[PDB]
Amino acid sequence: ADTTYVVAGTTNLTGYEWVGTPDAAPENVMTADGSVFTKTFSAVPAGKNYQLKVVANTGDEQKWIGLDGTDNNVTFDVETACDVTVTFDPATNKITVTGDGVKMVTDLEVNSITVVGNGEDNWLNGVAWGVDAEVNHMTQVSDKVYQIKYENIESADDAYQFKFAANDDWAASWGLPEQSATPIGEEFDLTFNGQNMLLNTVSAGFEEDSLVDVTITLDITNFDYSTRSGAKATVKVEPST
Ligand SMILES: OC[C@H]1O[C@H](O[C@H]2[C@H](O)[C@@H](O)[C@@H](O[C@H]3[C@H](O)[C@@H](O)[C@@H](O)O[C@@H]3CO)O[C@@H]2CO)[C@H](O)[C@@H](O)[C@@H]1O
């Protein structure tokens, strides 16, 4: 079974938005090199939070491979414009990123959190997937606790989707393991690089089209970057005042 490896990642690194198919991103197919595979990106600009994964393509079947045996994106900065080489070893699933200007990201300092989602009218202030929209910056109400409120939302199911994004980009984000309804009125654990959260207020007991006020709280007091574990949220829904 013939396997083709593709570097998928951010548009700024790869020229495509997380495209893992050889026919769709032929420039990012990795070349056979000894017992491993290599892809060099020419003159990558100085920048922060470049991200990639290696995608194994065997016919229609895709396997997305993240950092050092995890499902995390490989995340690095480039200090000075340089050629970045990505190495992949099928025997170990080791991904290496090398180059004079390359520095691996090994920690996260949160300076902002954006609520990002399918905004319309009062829902996320009308912003459609705006990762850096100031109006959806959560307020830091204490050390590592963030809150935002959306008032006068029409109660609906399968209408409202959202995630949390740190530092006005997608490098550090939270959602759920599968795209599914958020727990309502109870603290729940968040998945780093997770799927969209659904805010299904009819299923939460608020009559369709009735107005509700939504209060979202994000607690990263026990978030550990090394494990990507410990971020928690609460989504409070109340009849509108
Ligand atoms: O731009 C609209 C788009 O925004 C959101 O997608 C972002 C993801 O939430 C975010 O995690 C990241 O997703 C990539 C993963 O990091 C990566 O490991 C791999 O799985 O590819 C993912 C992209 O397919 O970046 C995207 C933005 O490109 C939102 O969740 C989407 O519903 C929405 O369409």
Numbering used by the authors: 492 to 732
Mind quoting what the paper says about this structure?
Ruminococcus bromii is a keystone species in the human gut that has the rare ability to degrade dietary resistant starch (RS). This bacterium secretes a suite of starch-active proteins that work together within larger complexes called amylosomes that allow R. bromii to bind and degrade RS. Starch adherence system protein 20 (Sas20) is one of the more abundant proteins assembled within amylosomes, but little could be predicted about its molecular features based on amino acid sequence. Here, we performed a structure–function analysis of Sas20 and determined that it features two discrete starch-binding domains separated by a flexible linker.
Furthermore, the crystal structure of a close homolog of Sas20 domain 2 revealed a unique bilobed starch-binding groove that targets the helical α1,4-linked glycan chains found in amorphous regions of amylopectin and crystalline regions of amylose. However, a single maltotriose molecule was captured between these modules with amino acids from both lobes coordinating the ligand. The aromatic ring of W509 in Sca5X25-2a interacts via van der Waals forces with the hexose ring of Glc3 at the reducing end. The O2 and O3 of Glc3 is stabilized by hydrogen bonding to the side chains of Sca5X25-2a N564 and Sca5X25-2b N684. The aromatic rings of W661 and side chain of K654 in Sca5X25-2b interact with the aglycone face and O2 of Glc2, respectively. The O6 of Glc2 is within 2.5 Å of the side chain of Sca5X25-2a E508. Glc1 interacts with W620, and its O2 and O3 coordinate with the side chain of N687. Sca5X25-2a and Sca5X25-2b overlay with an RMSD of 1.0 Å over 49 Cα atoms and demonstrate a conserved binding platform; when maltotriose is included in this overlay, the ligand displays the same polarity. The φ (O5-C1-O4’-C4′) and Ψ (C1-O4’-C4’-C5′) angles of maltotriose in our structure are φ = 107.5°, Ψ = −144.3° and φ = 90.8°, Ψ = −153.7°. The first φ/Ψ angles that is near the end of the chain is more obtuse, whereas the φ/Ψ angles cloistered within the binding cleft are similar to those found in double-helical amylose.
